Subunit: 338 residues, 4 copies
């Protein structure tokens, strides 16, 4: 009943994924392989020690030049930058977690399947429009085992789509805009240096850095009713994890702050429990670190102007919360496996 | 003889509260090629040692190129010009009558109502300019480039509003003039300030209590409602919040307004460039380069529109992103408002 | 057998102390009161949420206008800035934890005893030379219940004294100097602003800030053989917790790095277990956050030049590690109580 | 005629690697009132768009006051002076012979041995100056103010050492001259650099792999041993470590040496002031004000002794604390060493 999982790209998301999976009380996933350069010494070290996750409580050991163990469970470590040379056939790999960011299209991602894997889950927006995209709590019931390659979307779309779905259900969105005030990521430079994006080129811990986001338009992938309704931008700021979405939408049904928050609470207590949370305490970004939910509505910041302009402020741990959804989506593929 | 040359006379200025705004104000004023302002006194608890040191060395502004010296025990000099340093927590005890002080720059954040700011006038000064929103609703508020032409010498106590309101009101004025505003909301992603705690510690605001360089910290702002004090057609139309982030200066306003006239991003930016090239030159700027927050440090304008970020959704929802150096840019406006009072003096 | 404890000054150390005490498996301490301004709402909120400690797992509730509860145990909250008005007599206060920093002399600290307390433990260097000073792992066996006012010294002395004691035992110190590269503290300003010390006046998160330290000379209080042998300075850097001591000493007995590290390991495995730790992994400051030990020797950084110049690099969580020693010292007073 | 005026001729310079040091070097050179250097080429993968943008806008240095323009598709201009932008990862393909390049500034951190740096000479250049320690032990190393008088035109490949060695060696030279060094150790509390990771990520050095703006990060340094390359009497006498901390520039060396002659803090500082006022003017500075790291940004000297921190324990253990802007100060020395090669050319 368990499925055999391989992680491709042991970066922030790959390592978050493992630690999220290892913390699961009950799981249908058996992680047997990690493809990554740097090898057993980097993989074991960076899995154990983490500047934002903290020290992993599990026993992490280097078994030999191609294996690590986590609390005694051995994991093969491989190290090939080109996917076509991966031993997924020999290792009977069921599902590949694609966390490199590099192979996000059918040609790139499909290479895992050629080398033996049956299914690929991309931890990022797909470049191709023919790769289905899912957000747990929104449209994961639409997933079918017949899909060989799937996308769990971006961390920002996973924050936005759950509370946008509630807004569309209760009040109806006409159009809107969003800004995510977002922790810096590994894509940005530490000091001013080469980058395709001249804003991301600038020292990340010193600056507020505007950058494009696809998340506002990507919401229409999991909520078709949102097509063309939203746009937005990102502001990268000098924090290492936890981000916040600032959404302003014009709604169909005139309303007020407590009625909007009531809708979120109803979803949080029912169909979106564990995915959407409504926070009533006056907190700051660090308080939402390592929260399992995709979205935490900051209830006291909800604002309605002129009856139909609604402003919602939503916290999300863009690393840990997203990785829990990657685990949730992988567990869906396992429970649907034929 | 035939005639004398025209002589605009200089008003005598005292700075009360030699903090970030107080010291920014001094450096902004000292850099002006022309001024009608003669800064003759500073009220700092720390005496000449603190005042000279913190004026010279600045972690945000960098080192002051001017020659700063301790002349004696109650005076410093800036490029040879001496300034008296007084040290009184109570404005009633300040020697303004003795020093013939015309205008007081209130930068303590404490004497922000008629009673408190009025103590300077009881002490001998003629006029008080509060570098903050006034707590008193009958205290007139001005934003240069927006409504400073409504200033009158007969106002003894005036407010230069908040730094966020000074960024917001200029480009909101253009939006209201050209397209008309129905309603709107904003968020300012704002550098941390001295009101925030370095490590989690006591604060009336439980979010401002949290470590400022570690967190995104939501806090209230009156700046969106305050716009209506300088643009009365906007009463009840704007609200917003602030998000304090771990940078030491420069902030950015993100405004979303529903407008009456359907428009598009290039038409909105064209309206800003029109204002920037004409009536709002030096106050409002339109930036075309792909810059980040640090690039707007020590910029003299109140507002820098990030033109590439302008968005319009569904014809009448306009999103505008505007940078502002909340310390230097605001302080240049404090100098400008003080110059208005000098030009219209008596 | 338990003693009744009051905490004066619910700041970083006061709140760290409570959370350290609440985590103790077995304790002789019963914390019944906290004297502090801001009252139940600040005290409950800042006890629950913490930017470096993280969220307190215990249930923290506001019972009424003068009480909070931690997992159901009620704690009276009082709020008087002058110690003389404290109800320690009425509350039968045995021991006061002095964490304000303001009352560090017999006149200041003794005011607690006048108002009813029997003993005062200062969480800082004493201003007076007649107030005995103790460092757990070094000279806590010299404490006597007859001492009404005691000092647990500074966080830097608690890092330095344990491994300095080993160095003096094994090799003999002639003279030395230390620099602590230290996280910023609440004494520093966030932005350039008024301060008695014009260096501490400067923006703390932007700067390397030199400042004086008494810790090098304070070591002679708990190790008399060190009198006049050490001096040093502090460099405050833009991290919120965890610091590192860089000690260079000339020693009597010529030696080498592995022999110096062997001495530390012997103490760490024996008489200084739980106080001194020798770290063999290549770690960074965040990895030592919330470590219970006073001192973590970074073994691979130990260096010996010219046979008798020894350089030792020691990590310490200046908040959590120090607070565990404050708890350890308080537990000593309880076990010695007559 | 009687005579011609004396004409020191300018050598033609190419910058390879337009990073922090490459761009600092350009801005340092452009600010010189006199120079024998004519920078005619830059090798940047990013083409004119990147080069012009990152030269103009700098999060550490601030905005470049000079006029920076894209002239065409292979040239930028700086105050009207054009500079060719080439884009070749392989130095063997660079057009140095075609461009008559005399000297190449190697600031890639890659071509640091005779083979790699020698590729520029195969490509047509005459001499290579590595802005880093040379991996090759026969590559001569120079520190201005210490041993640049031993430089010879007949060296085709030279090293300007590391930024820490440039801070250390000047004030170590004074200590050795006046008191004599037995042995010593140091720690540099150092700003983070581009070799460190923003978030925990892959790195050969498991400590440099850790998030740079969040941590105190110990790392190895050859700078203490490297002093012996420019001061041979110091061979085997110094070692040390580095502690990377969350600041973006400016670093501080903390040196503890046992000396032969018993001394005291004022006598040590007097020795530094002697050097600072005479043979090491412009290289070594003695700071008396109580400053912090940011105050030493964009200081041209290699070393600033924090005089109040000088300590002597037990007569012969001297502790010295010295500030250095590891980007700007070092780059001014790169310009200085390049000027030495120009002055002694052929
Ligand atoms: N960080 C976040 O907040 C989130 C990011 N994501 C997505 O997750 C993905 C990774 O982001 P993140 O993990 O943050 O960035 P990281 O750089 O931290 O992870 C990247 C990892 O991929 C590895 N890698 C790169 N190329 C290859 C290759 N050819 N073969 C094998 N391994 C390779 C890198 O190893 P090396 O260092 O050796 O190149 C690195 O360990 C991206 O698609 C990103 O958009 C989505 C949601 C959350
Ligand atoms: N910083 C910003 O971005 C902007 C702030 N403002 C406003 O400007 C004002 C100051 O802000 P800022 O300068 O940033 O904060 P600061 O704390 O840096 O300035 C405060 C100064 O006031 C002094 N002070 C306080 N009380 C008294 C008193 N009773 N008598 C004399 N001096 C006193 C303080 O001295 P001590 O330290 O000795 O108490 C300190 O130097 C506030 O009203 C703020 O809202 C507006 C726009 C921009
Ligand atoms: N932080 C560290 O790393 C360590 C610090 N220490 C020592 O611990 C002590 C506290 O340091 P820290 O806790 O960091 O600084 P904090 O400011 O965080 O703690 C100070 C607390 O004392 C309270 N306080 C101040 N005056 C009074 C008063 N008159 N009556 C009652 N409560 C008062 C403050 O409340 P309000 O905010 O209302 O004034 C604040 O909560 C100092 O002596 C320090 O030297 C020693 C080792 C570790
Ligand atoms: N930063 C400091 O404090 C100091 C550093 N140094 C030394 O200076 C050198 C550079 O340091 P720094 O400038 O800080 O690091 P940077 O990475 O900022 O400079 C590196 C530059 O080299 C370019 N580059 C890399 N490989 C090549 C190549 N094969 N061909 C052409 N260009 C290339 C990079 O471009 P891309 O980004 O496109 O790869 C980048 O622009 C290093 O040797 C360093 O040790 C010495 C003293 C001071």
């Amino acid at each position: 009943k368990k499925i055999r999982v391989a992680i491709n790209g042991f970066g922030r998301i790959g390592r978050n994924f493992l630690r999220c999976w290892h913390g699961r009380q009950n799981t249908l996933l058996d992680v047997v392989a990690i493809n990554d350069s740097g090898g057993v010494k980097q993989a074991s070290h960076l899995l154990k020690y983490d500047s934002t996750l903290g020290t992993f409580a599990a026993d992490v050991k280097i078994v030999d030049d191609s294996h690590i163990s986590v609390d005694g469970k051995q994991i093969k470590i491989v190290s090939s930058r080109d996917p076509l040379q991966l031993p997924w056939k020999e290792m009977n790999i069921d599902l590949v977690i694609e966390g490199t960011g590099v192979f996000i299209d059918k040609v790139g991602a499909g290479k895992h399947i050629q080398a033996g894997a049956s299914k690929v889950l991309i931890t990022a927006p797909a470049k191709d429009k023919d790769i289905p995209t899912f957000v747990v709590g929104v449209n994961e019931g639409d997933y079918k085992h017949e899909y060989p390659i799937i996308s769990n979307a971006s961390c920002t779309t996973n924050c936005l789509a759950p509370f946008v779905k509630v807004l569309e259900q209760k009040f109806g969105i006409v159009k809107g805009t969003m800004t995510t005030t977002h922790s810096y990521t590994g894509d940005q430079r530490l000091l001013d240096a080469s980058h395709r994006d001249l804003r991301r080129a600038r020292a990340a811990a010193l600056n507020i850095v505007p950058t494009t986001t696809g998340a506002a338009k990507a919401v229409s992938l999991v909520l078709p009713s949102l097509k063309g309704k939203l746009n937005g931008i990102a502001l990268r700021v000098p924090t290492p994890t936890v981000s916040v979405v600032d959404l302003v939408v014009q709604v169909e049904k005139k309303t007020f702050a407590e009625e909007v928050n009531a809708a979120f609470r109803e979803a949080a207590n029912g169909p979106m429990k564990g995915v959407l949370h409504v926070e009533d305490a006056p907190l700051v970004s660090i308080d939402f670190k390592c929260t399992d939910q995709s979205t935490s509505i900051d209830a006291s910041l909800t604002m309605v102007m002129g009856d139909d302009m609604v402003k919602v402020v939503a916290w999300y741990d863009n690393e840990w919360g997203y990785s829990q959804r990657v685990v949730d989506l992988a567990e869906v593929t396992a429970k649907k496996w034929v």
